[PDB]
Amino acid sequence: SHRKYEAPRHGHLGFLPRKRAASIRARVKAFPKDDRSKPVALTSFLGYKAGMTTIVRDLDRPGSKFHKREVVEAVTVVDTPPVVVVGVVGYVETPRGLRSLTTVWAEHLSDEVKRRFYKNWYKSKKKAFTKYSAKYAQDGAGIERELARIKKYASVVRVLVHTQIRKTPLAQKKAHLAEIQLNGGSISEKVDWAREHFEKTVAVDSVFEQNEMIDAIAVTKGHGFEGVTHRWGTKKLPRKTHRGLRKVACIGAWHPAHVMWSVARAGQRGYHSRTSINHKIYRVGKGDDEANGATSFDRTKKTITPMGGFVHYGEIKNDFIMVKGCIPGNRKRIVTLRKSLYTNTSRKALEEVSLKWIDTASKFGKGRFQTPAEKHAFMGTLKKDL
Amino acid sequence: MKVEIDSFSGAKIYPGRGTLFVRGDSKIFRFQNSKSASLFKQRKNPRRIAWTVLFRKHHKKGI
Amino acid sequence: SGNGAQGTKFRISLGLPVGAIMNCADNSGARNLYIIAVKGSGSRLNRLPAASLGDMVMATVKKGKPELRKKVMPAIVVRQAKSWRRRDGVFLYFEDNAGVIANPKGEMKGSAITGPVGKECADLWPRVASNSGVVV
RNA sequence: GCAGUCAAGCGUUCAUAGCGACAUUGCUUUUUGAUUCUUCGAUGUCGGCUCUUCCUAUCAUACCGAAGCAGAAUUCGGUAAGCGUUGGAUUGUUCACCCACUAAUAGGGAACGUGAGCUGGGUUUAGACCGUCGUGAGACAGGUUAGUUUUACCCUACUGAUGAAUGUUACCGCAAUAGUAAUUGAACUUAGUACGAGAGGAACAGUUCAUUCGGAUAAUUGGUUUUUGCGGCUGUCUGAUCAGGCAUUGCCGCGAAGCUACCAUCCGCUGGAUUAUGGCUGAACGCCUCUAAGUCAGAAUCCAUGCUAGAACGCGGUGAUUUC
RNA sequence: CAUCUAAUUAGUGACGCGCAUGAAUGGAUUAACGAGAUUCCCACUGUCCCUAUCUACUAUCUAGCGAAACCACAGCCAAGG
RNA sequence: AACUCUGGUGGAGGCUCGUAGCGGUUCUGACGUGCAAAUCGAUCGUCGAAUUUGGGUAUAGGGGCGAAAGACUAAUCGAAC
Ligand SMILES: [Mg+2]
Ligand SMILES: [Mg+2]
Ligand SMILES: [Mg+2]
Ligand SMILES: [Mg+2]
Ligand SMILES: [Mg+2]
Ligand SMILES: [Mg+2]
Ligand SMILES: [Mg+2]
Ligand SMILES: [Mg+2]
Ligand SMILES: [Mg+2]
Ligand SMILES: [Mg+2]
Ligand SMILES: [Mg+2]
Ligand SMILES: [Mg+2]
Ligand SMILES: [Mg+2]
Ligand SMILES: [Mg+2]
Ligand SMILES: [Mg+2]
Ligand SMILES: [Mg+2]
Ligand SMILES: [Mg+2]
Ligand SMILES: [Mg+2]
Ligand SMILES: [Mg+2]
Ligand SMILES: [Mg+2]
Ligand SMILES: [Mg+2]
Ligand SMILES: [Mg+2]
Ligand SMILES: [Mg+2]
Ligand SMILES: [Mg+2]
Ligand SMILES: [Mg+2]
Ligand SMILES: [Mg+2]
Ligand SMILES: [Mg+2]
Ligand SMILES: [Mg+2]
Ligand SMILES: [Mg+2]
Ligand SMILES: [Mg+2]
Ligand SMILES: [Mg+2]
Ligand SMILES: [Mg+2]
Ligand SMILES: [Mg+2]
Ligand SMILES: [Mg+2]
Ligand SMILES: [Mg+2]
Ligand SMILES: [Mg+2]
Ligand SMILES: [Mg+2]
Ligand SMILES: [Mg+2]
Ligand SMILES: [Mg+2]
Ligand SMILES: [Mg+2]
Ligand SMILES: [Mg+2]
Ligand SMILES: [Mg+2]
Ligand SMILES: [Mg+2]
Ligand SMILES: [Mg+2]
Ligand SMILES: [Mg+2]
Ligand SMILES: [Mg+2]
Ligand SMILES: [Mg+2]
Ligand SMILES: [Mg+2]
Ligand SMILES: [Mg+2]
């Protein structure tokens, strides 16, 4: 007999299986549609999530009650050093899908990206690409032949980039290597752009602008084996119950004589690859810059880093993307920021955002001071000779 | 873009920090944090809490 | 919520489910209001209809004049005592839960509200703001 | 319980806008009768809670056709199960009834879904009281009160997790297939405009929010506190001091980090093909006709874009490939 | 019918041609008492809205020790019969 | 005037709160191939007498014994072994 009281289904059946992702670097499964008229540029860029902080800005939303009034907003900071270009990949449309036809690598790879090919770097002879680096010998004939192949065939051109992780306050030393599809026209011009940019670094201000919707592709924070109440949002059973209340009570009818795939069950929570769209870029900040945390309304010569570093991350010494709200993945984690797959004109996009203040108080407590000079001016002098 | 003052500790309140309490006689009490909020709700006098601005100017600490 | 409301409301944190008794702020002769419903509520299984500041609720009177007691009547929540965030970042709360008796068109049965009134309630109901004194 | 055919008649006139007598033909197994076919060397017996899926006989939402459709509100019907379909008083109830919100509070199935999931309120093994019946022991689909709810570690199924084999090993990918998700409302404006004699009173576009759901995230706020971090306090013990022990985390206040909350924030894509329906051209049938050939628009539908997993017997590109 | 509630097959107070009440098979009442049955109110609370977090002991993995129920043969479904 | 009132004293009661003790209300908690063929934890009733209990003794099966449940009579009771 029927349900007697209709309720919505707990959880989303399209975010299944709720399993651990294949790697920490969540793959971009869709790049923007290639406009062949625009200049050649990256469609994604790779960063490491530093942390969240707080901004204040005048909201420009006519008809809203907070039009021309200050809103206090959460932002996510992605520490974002320039990526080095180390290869190009050609992709041929086949009746079974895209097919990588050939990869061409740059002549010199740094030890960061060479570390990506080694599970035991300290033991190795470090022989990777030692015979590929002899393909650039005396005229680069075997490299220009493969690049001519990518120009002749290969309807899609992706570039191999790697993060500069030694510029990042991480203990990892091992770069993250990823393909980013080159949008911008003429397959020949894309291969020419990649070949000019071999061993060169692309910064984030050449990819992303302020007031731009971007997509965040990242593996979320891992939470181990989790039960069905916190994994799926199911109701806790009443207090009187025997053998447990953090459960799903009926996991199926008698017929079908099988537990269904749509019945909520316990298992892994978190560490799922997620794509989250439409996050507004509030600041493309520069690393060769004090007053990263200063606005035109603040003018306090402070960087984006809070007092005492970003908690559990470090301090930002590179370029960064300050983006609106929450992105998937925890701090220290590789995140791929991607240009929007559609042209959004919804008036929450297309809104010119000017920050008035950026919170650089300590996130290691309930921190009260924005700068150490502010701490000195409030607290006065101390017993340690302040 | 206004920095308020905590009604217990005299602490500078930046936007978002702490809470605001409207009493029955409609007096606004802004608190920088839950420490000040709980000490106010415990009916503690700020003049006897040894780290507050009111204490330090009542005892002429650092002037 | 429905009729009488002059504008929209940003989402205020719900602090007054059904069964909540709030004080009666106006001078209509009631002492408290017992919330039996919330106008504009959402239909979710097991979930209580819950009010917030500025919401028009259905209420009875448990303490007050006998001519107001034992009846269903509209009320408007004017004080919440549950912490809610404004879009200027301020998490604020009142000391007590309070509402005023109104008719379904939003005009207020009493004549004077004793105490502060939330700004969202005053901006949503102009008859509450007209009889209100201090707003927040 | 729900349909259909005929049409005397009701409907100011007018059979068929909406109904429709006398007849008559059916559907479904969601009630109840009928059987005794399976089960008597245990198929756990109602209701509720929980949770999933399915049906359409569509309550709402989307798009439409008809009216005794002026507007508003309704009424009849089509595609349509994509998406929702409530909070309570009483009662063990299913059912009922009322209060109230809502876009709406549609009907059903899944061993009258679901007891090694729960609960045990109902029926009730032994206790007991009453009423009636009986001389009595006792009876009552009469009332009342109390009454042990056992086991999974096996196989499968599901949920997550490894993993031999492919020359080895590493990196970067393709995407067959499977899943898929967003939902609804209000205020402003249109506009007191269209329509109407008035009374009344819309819609599209625009904008701001909100409901339900989902996926994250923890800057802020709240919660948690074995940070036994810092302070305080009781009782006792270490001769007092200092510093501590014990009080099964002794208690109180604050408490970073971590986890977390519609109790907090952020985010939740747009193309094509269609159904109903309205059409174009146009015969059949020299006229007419959306249809027969051909064709246009078009639903919350469908399939893609997007999203999730990646076939551990699907594939590709690339790096290095062991002797002194 | 009244009262209690927004709403009460509950509670209480009444009415009584009472299927089938009733006088030691005791009738009516009754202070105090009751781990009895029931209803309402105040206080209180994670009972709930709506769930979150912490602790210890498990579970888990290991060294050792090491059972039992059950068992025709076994173990992927859909439909048919 | 019969006689009233007040403050002490005294220490009664099958009186009360509550240890030991004796029971066993609720969780319908734990366990439920148990520590246990009835236990464990919290919560409870009672706690100076119709109390609780050891030893001795008596009553024996269609018999006993029963402040009465067909209860108990050696894990056996609507008739033990
Ligand atoms: Mg239903
Ligand atoms: Mg569903
Ligand atoms: Mg793709
Ligand atoms: Mg963990
Ligand atoms: Mg946990
Ligand atoms: Mg599981
Ligand atoms: Mg974030
Ligand atoms: Mg922090
Ligand atoms: Mg419920
Ligand atoms: Mg048999
Ligand atoms: Mg059985
Ligand atoms: Mg069975
Ligand atoms: Mg149909
Ligand atoms: Mg219809
Ligand atoms: Mg279907
Ligand atoms: Mg479905
Ligand atoms: Mg059943
Ligand atoms: Mg079962
Ligand atoms: Mg059972
Ligand atoms: Mg019972
Ligand atoms: Mg095991
Ligand atoms: Mg869709
Ligand atoms: Mg969540
Ligand atoms: Mg002890
Ligand atoms: Mg201690
Ligand atoms: Mg949510
Ligand atoms: Mg024609
Ligand atoms: Mg057609
Ligand atoms: Mg045709
Ligand atoms: Mg078409
Ligand atoms: Mg598209
Ligand atoms: Mg594979
Ligand atoms: Mg009741
Ligand atoms: Mg009576
Ligand atoms: Mg007694
Ligand atoms: Mg252990
Ligand atoms: Mg162990
Ligand atoms: Mg066999
Ligand atoms: Mg089968
Ligand atoms: Mg006694
Ligand atoms: Mg006693
Ligand atoms: Mg005792
Ligand atoms: Mg003894
Ligand atoms: Mg038990
Ligand atoms: Mg067990
Ligand atoms: Mg044993
Ligand atoms: Mg005898
Ligand atoms: Mg008997
Ligand atoms: Mg015996």
Measured CA to CA in angstroms, residue A121 lies from A25, A113, A117, A291 at distances of 20, 11, 9, 39
* Cβ C3 vs Cβ C106: under 8 Å: yes
Cα A315 to ligand 24 centre (Å): 52
Among A79, A37, A21, A75, which Cα is nearest to A358's?
A75
Distance CA A116, CA A104 (A): 17
What is the β-pairing status of strands B4-5 and A273-285? Answer: unpaired
**Is B55 within 8 Å of B47 (Cβ atoms)?**
yes
Within 27-46 of B, beta carbons closer than 8 Å to C belong to 28
Q: Does B35 touch chain A (CB under 8 A)?
A: yes
Chains that touch A (3 or more CB pairs under 8 A): B, C
Q: Are A19 and A272 in contact (CB under 8 A)?
A: yes
Contacts of A6 in chain C (CB under 8 A): 45
Contacts of B among chains (3+ CB pairs under 8 A):
A, C
The conformational region for residue B60 under phi > 0 = left, psi -120 to 50 = alpha, else beta, is left
C70 in A contact zone (CB under 8 Å) = no
CB of A248 lies under 7 Å from some atom of strand D: yes
Q: Are A335 and A49 in contact (CB under 8 A)?
A: yes
Round to whole Å and give the CA distance between A356 and A354.
Answer: 6
Q: A240 CA, F67 C1': separation in Å?
A: 39
Q: Quick check: B60 contacting C, CB < 8 Å?
A: no
d(CA A67, ligand 27 centre) in Å: 57
* C-alpha span between A218 and A329 (Å, rounded): 5
C89 at interface of A, judged by CB pairs closer than 8 A: yes
Residues of A in contact with C44 (CB under 8 A): 7
User: Do β-strands A83-94 and A225-226 pair in parallel, antiparallel, or remain unpaired?
Assistant: unpaired
Burial of A255 (0-12, 13-18, 19+ CB in 10 A): exposed
The set of residues, in sequence order, having a beta carbon less than 8 Å from that of A107 and lying 6+ positions away, is: A133, A136, A198, A199
C14, amino acid identity: L
| Environment of ion ligand 4 (residues, CB < 5 A) | A 224
CA dihedral A304, A301, B5, A283 (to 10 degrees): -40
Whether A325 CB is under 7 Å from strand D: yes
Is the CB of residue A215 less than 8 Å from the CB of residue A338?
yes
Å between CA of A177 and C1' of D196: 73
Method: cryo-EM
Pairing relation of β-strands C91-94 and B19-22? parallel
Side-chain-facing half-sphere of C35: CA atoms under 13 Å: 30
Whole-angstrom distance, CA of residue A161 vs CA of residue A222: 26
C30 touches strand E (CB under 7 A): no
The dihedral formed by the CA atoms of A100, A106, A111 and A115, expressed in degrees to the nearest 10: 10
Structure-derived torsion over alpha carbons of residues A175, A181, A182, A184, reported in degrees to the nearest 10? -150
The answer to whether residues B4 and B15 touch, using CB atoms and an 8 Å cutoff, is no
Cα distance from A74 to chain C (closest Cα, Å)? Answer: 10
- Is nucleic acid strand F under 7 Å from A258's C-beta? no
Cβ contact (<8 Å) for C134 and B19?
no
Minimum CA–C1' distance nucleotide for B19:
D221
Sign of CA dihedral C96, C101, C105, C111: negative
Contact A40, A185 (CB under 8 A): yes
Smallest CA–CA separation between A58 and chain C, in Å?
10
Strand duo A97-105 + A355-358: pairing: unpaired
